[PDB]
Design an enzyme around this catalytic site. Structure first.
Site, PDB file in Angstrom:
ATOM      1  CB  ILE A 107      -0.911   0.089   1.260  1.00  0.00           C
ATOM      2  CG1 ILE A 107      -1.692  -1.217   1.479  1.00  0.00           C
ATOM      3  CG2 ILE A 107      -1.844   1.300   1.163  1.00  0.00           C
ATOM      4  CD1 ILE A 107      -2.368  -1.316   2.855  1.00  0.00           C
ATOM      5  CB  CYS A 108       1.447   3.991  -2.401  1.00  0.00           C
ATOM      6  SG  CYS A 108       2.563   5.402  -2.507  1.00  0.00           S
ATOM      7  CG  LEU A 109      -1.771   5.458   3.786  1.00  0.00           C
ATOM      8  CD1 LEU A 109      -2.622   6.413   2.974  1.00  0.00           C
ATOM      9  CD2 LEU A 109      -2.659   4.526   4.581  1.00  0.00           C
TER      10      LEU A 109
END
Ligand code: ZN
Ligand code: ZN
Ligand code: ZN
Ligand code: ZN
Lengths: 95, 148, 99
Positions: free
Chosen positions: B85-87
Site C-alpha cells: 500500500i502506498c500510504l
C-alpha cells in the site's frame, strides 16, 4: 469531594474556576483566558511565577488548554452550563 | 515488553471503540501478527467487498510503523499485486501516536479517494485519471471476483 | 489558524466577566492518556507550541528519532527547549488517582 480539586483547577488571578483555561507556555502556568489576556495588557510577567515573556506581544506565548477545560468540565458537573447561562444573562441585559 | 504492552492496549481500545466498517486482531495467538478486515466503503466502487489485510508489528512498535498489506486482490492505483500500500503514514509519515484503528480508517479514505499522482500501478492510475467509468467498472468487477 | 489579534480578542461579555466561584475517574480516560504508550500519563512533558502531553520516556524515545515533530499534531519541535515538564498535571493526575 469536588472541593479537593480546587488548587489544580482554579485561577491564581480571580480565584474562581479556570474558565477557558489559557497557558503561558514558557513556564506552563494556566489562568482564565480573560484574566491572563487582561493582565498582559500592561505586564509581561507571568502573574504566578514572575517569569518574563520575551516577545514584544506576550499573546504570542499563550495557548488555549483544551484538554484541561474538558477535565474541569467533567470534574465540576454543571460548570459548562453555568458559564453559558452567565453569558446569556449578560447579553439579555445588553442587547 | 513495551511493544507487547502497547499492542494489548490497542486491542482493548478496539473492543471498546471499533473503527467503522473495520475489524482487526491476532491470527492464532501471535500478538505481533494480526489480520484485519475492511468492508468496501459505500461511496466507492469497492462497495459490498470484504477485504483482508495482514499486519506485522515490529519489535520497537509503536516507534516504527507496522507492515500492513492487502491479502485480497484489489484494483486500485495505490495498491499493487503484492498487496503493498502506498500510504504516507505507513512509511515516511509514521508517528508513534498512530494506531491500527487510525491506519485502517486512512486506508478506507484511500479506497474512497485514490492518489493517482503517487501510484504503485501506473496503468490503473492512468485509467483512473483519463476514464473514471472504466476504473469504476473494473474496480467493481475485481470486487466481485476477489472480495467475497 | 486565525490571526493572533482575533484569537485573543475578548467579547463584551468577557471584558466584564466575574469569577465562577469554587464523579468517576473512568470518564477521564482520554484526557489523561499518553498518545504514545496509550497508558495514563507519567512524568508528564508538554509541548510549548501545541500543549500536547506525553510521558517523559515516551516523547524522548520518539524524538530520537524522530523527525523532530510533535507525534500528535506534527508541529515542528525546534529544540530541547520545545518540551517542558508539567508537574501540575502530574499532581492533578495524582489527586484523581491516589496512590
Ligand atoms: Zn481567572
Ligand atoms: Zn509562570
Ligand atoms: Zn507514554
Ligand atoms: Zn502537538
Amino acid at each position: 469531594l469536588v472541593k479537593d480539586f480546587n488548587p489544580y483547577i482554579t485561577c491564581y488571578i480571580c480565584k474562581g474556576y479556570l474558565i477557558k483555561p489559557t497557558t503561558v507556555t514558557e513556564c506552563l502556568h494556566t489562568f482564565c483566558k480573560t484574566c491572563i489576556v487582561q493582565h498582559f495588557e500592561d505586564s509581561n510577567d507571568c502573574p504566578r511565577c514572575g517569569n518574563q515573556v520575551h516577545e514584544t506581544n506576550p499573546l504570542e506565548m499563550l495557548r488555549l488548554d483544551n484538554t484541561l477545560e474538558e477535565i474541569i468540565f467533567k470534574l465540576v458537573p454543571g460548570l459548562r452550563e453555568q458559564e453559558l447561562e452567565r453569558e446569556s444573562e449578560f447579553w439579555k441585559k445588553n442587547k | 515488553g513495551s511493544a507487547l504492552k502497547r499492542i494489548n492496549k490497542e486491542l482493548s481500545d478496539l473492543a471498546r471503540d471499533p473503527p467503522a466498517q473495520c475489524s482487526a486482531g491476532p491470527v492464532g495467538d501471535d500478538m505481533f501478527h494480526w489480520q484485519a478486515t475492511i468492508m468496501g466503503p459505500n461511496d466507492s466502487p469497492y462497495q459490498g467487498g470484504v477485504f483482508f489485510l495482514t499486519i506485522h508489528f515490529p519489535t520497537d512498535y509503536p516507534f516504527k510503523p507496522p507492515k500492513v498489506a492487502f491479502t485480497t486482490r484489489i484494483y486500485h492505483p495505490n495498491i499493487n499485486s503484492n498487496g503493498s500500500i502506498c500510504l504516507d503514514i505507513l512509511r515516511s509519515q509514521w508517528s508513534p501516536a498512530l494506531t491500527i484503528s487510525k491506519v485502517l480508517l486512512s486506508i478506507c479514505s484511500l479506497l474512497c479517494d485514490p492518489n493517482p499522482d503517487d501510484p504503485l500501478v501506473p496503468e490503473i492510475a492512468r485509467i483512473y485519471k483519463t476514464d473514471r467509468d472504466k476504473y469504476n467498472r473494473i474496480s467493481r468487477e475485481w470486487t466481485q471476483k476477489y472480495a467475497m | 489558524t486565525q490571526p493572533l489579534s482575533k484569537t485573543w480578542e475578548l467579547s463584551l461579555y468577557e471584558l466584564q466577566r466575574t469569577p465562577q466561584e469554587a464523579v468517576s475517574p473512568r470518564s477521564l480516560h482520554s484526557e489523561l492518556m499518553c498518545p504514545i504508550c496509550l497508558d495514563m500519563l507519567k512524568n508528564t512533558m508538554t509541548t510549548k507550541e501545541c500543549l500536547h502531553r506525553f510521558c517523559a520516556d515516551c516523547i524522548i524515545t520518539a524524538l530520537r528519532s524522530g523527525n523532530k515533530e510533535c507525534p500528535t499534531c506534527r508541529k515542528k519541535l525546534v529544540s530541547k527547549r520545545s518540551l517542558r515538564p508539567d508537574p501540575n498535571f502530574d499532581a492533578l493526575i495524582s489527586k484523581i488517582y491516589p496512590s
